[PDB]
């Protein structure tokens, strides 16, 4: 070869930069609703006379 290995004046290039991190786990889920509020008392019948 024309110019031998002793005449290679270039400088070596850096290593590969690292690989990116992984994605996150899917977030949880908003708390589910509550069961319908219980109805009120029921008015007793007419008072006697």
């Amino acid at each position: 070869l024309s110019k031998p290995k002793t005449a290679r004046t270039e400088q070596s290039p850096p290593p590969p930069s690292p690989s990116p991190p992984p994605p996150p786990p899917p977030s949880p889920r908003p708390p589910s609703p509550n069961p319908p509020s219980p109805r009120p008392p029921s008015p007793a019948p007419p008072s006697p006379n």
């Binding site: 031998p4 290995k5 002793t6 005449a7």
Partner: protein, 48 residues
């Protein structure tokens, strides 16, 4: 002839292969050409 370069090529072999999942084993080869001063006599000189 005097005052020309010359290519010294070294090939190194390890008894056990580097672990497959681990990083590369990084080596620093310190070299004394055999004609200049008396060569380092301690590992500190080789590492310098």
């Amino acid at each position: 002839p005097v005052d020309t370069a010359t290519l010294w090529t070294y090939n190194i072999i390890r008894s056990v292969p580097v672990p497959a999942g681990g990083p590369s084993l990084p080596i620093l080869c310190s070299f004394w050409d055999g004609k200049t001063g008396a060569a380092p006599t301690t590992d500190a000189g080789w590492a310098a």
